[PDB]
Structures are given as C-alpha cells and as structure tokens.
Amino acid sequence: IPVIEPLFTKVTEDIPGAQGPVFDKNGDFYIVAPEVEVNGKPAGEILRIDLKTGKKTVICKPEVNGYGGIPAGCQCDRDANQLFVADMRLGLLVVQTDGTFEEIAKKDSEGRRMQGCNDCAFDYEGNLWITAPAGEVAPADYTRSMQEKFGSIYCFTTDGQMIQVDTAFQFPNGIAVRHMNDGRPYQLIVAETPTKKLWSYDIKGPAKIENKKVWGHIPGTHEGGADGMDFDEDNNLLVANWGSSHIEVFGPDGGQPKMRIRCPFEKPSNLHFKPQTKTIFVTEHENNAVWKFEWQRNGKKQYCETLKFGIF
Ligand SMILES: [Ca+2]
C-alpha cells in the first residue's frame, strides 16, 4: 500500500482529547475537548479556533443537572448556522455560535434511554446518522463499549425522531454517508474501533438501513483502530487510524486501503475538510493538538454547504 507524507502544519495546542473538527456556514473552525476535567469529573468543552492566530475560545462547556458533558463529534446544520454535537455523557446536543446549547433527547423513539454519542454525519436529505459507543447518558454511570458489544447507531430525522437503527457494536466511532452522484444517500459507513473493521449498510431511506456488511479492513494490531472519517469529492474515504500514525484512504468500493497518509503523530482522532479546499484539519490525541495538511483534492460537499432553495 503506497504511503504519502504531506506536510502537517500545527494549528492549535493544549486541547485534552482533541477531536470533532468542523467548519460552520461562515467558514469558522471548531473542535471539541472531551477530556477537560474539573476535580476528576467530566467538564468537556466545545471551542472556536481563530485560524489566523491559532488562539482558542471555549464557547460551550455543556452541563445538564450538574453532569458535565464529554463533547466528542460535530456536524454543522444547513437551515441554521448551528452545530450538532455528539456528547459521550449527554447524547446529542445542538450548540449555537453564542455558546448556548440544548439537549436533543434523553430517550429514543422507543422510549429507551439515550446512549452517549461520539460522532455523527448528515446525509443530503438532512438526516443525522450518529454513533453511540457509550452506555446510557448521564445520570447513569459512565461506561463505554471498548470491550463489550453494547454500542449503538442512531438516526435523528428531519421530523425530529431519534431512532436507534442498530446495536451490538464494539465501540462504533467514525461515521460517514456515501451519496450517489445525484445526491441520493445510499450507503452508511461505520467504524468499529477495536475490531479493525469498517461496516457498511445500504441506506434505503430516512432511518432505514439494511444489509450490514464488513466493508473495509483497518491495518495494524495496535490498540486502537478506525476513529473519525470523511469523504473527499471523489468518494474516497479517509479514516483516522488511532494508534497507527496513519490516516487510511479507502477507494469507493472499500476493502483494503489503497493509500495511507503518514502523520507526525501516533494518534489521529478525526479529520475534516475546510470548505472549497484540499485542506484537511486533523485532530490527534498524542499531543492533544490540531494540524492541517493538503490532500490530493477537495472534500466532499457537506450538507451545510448545499442549498435548500436552489434551482440545481
Ligand atoms: Ca469530520
């Protein structure tokens, strides 16, 4: 497997468990620091990063009834410039640029207690596919599916339903939606960290997935595996392989990586493209920092970049 070593430029530092890189509708950059703690208790943060200076600003430090959050992944909304943030303790949150937030659901569509989420992905129809590797949300005792298969997958629909679409995953982590050239969502990819697998499903409709399949294989025998992921404009899937010092590049058909990207660190956690560029911002856990490098092409257009009221 051919490996490339592009120049990684430092963006910002000192962000405990740095991940969830995302750009909003104005091109502003945000990341999450899930591991910030106050007296050993969760006090995770959502930060805005000034790309010109690298200076950090904590816009949200989510807490519900005294239970601090562990913000873990993000997606920017389209119809309003707001962030949907997966939280390992609080489930799914909607965070405004002013720093205020709202908890989306304490229970799913079946009345079952919500699970802590790690990452999410919007399809072009506006449906949000979410990974939930943690156990029940706060106030329940914090647990995570690294060893046992209790991690779930959800789909927060346009009509506001929080639907659990699958279960029994050993730490479902990164998640991405593959679309047809005409924009129709047709395949859901889910990373299962410790098992070194990438799973796929055929998206038949909103909150409807079928035919679970082992889509791709993650290299290495190290502790870790596939973390965050994202598609480029040609539908190649770039996946952070936590603990391998590489970002794996899968072709549109999956299987084994067709290319690897060497990182100047061992623990890449997530990655996200800057709109309209080849620039990929990579968060990592070794130094708790954010970096950026140039990919071979532009990123796949995000849902937030599309137009609701366009002609085409
Ligand atoms: Ca991303």
Swiss-Prot record:
Consequence recorded when altering W242H: 27% decrease in activity
Temperature optimum or stability note: Optimum temperature is 35 degrees Celsius.
Effect of mutating D230S: 3% increase in activity. 19% decrease in activity
Effect noted on mutating Y142S: 8% increase in activity
InterPro entries: 6-blade_b-propeller_TolB-like, SGL, SMP-30/CGR1_Lactonase
Chain positions recorded as Ca(2+) 2 binding sites: D230, L271, H272
Outcome reported for the amino acid change (mutating H285N): 97% decrease in activity
Keyword Metal-binding (UniProt): yes
Residues annotated as catalytic: H285
Effect of W242Y: No effect on activity
Outcome recorded upon mutating F171V: 46% decrease in activity
Function: Biological function and substrate unknown. However, it is capable of acting on phosphorus anhydride bonds (such as phosphorus-halide and phosphorus-cyanide) in organophosphorus compounds (including nerve gases).
Full protein name: Diisopropyl-fluorophosphatase
Annotated source species: Loligo vulgaris (Common European squid)
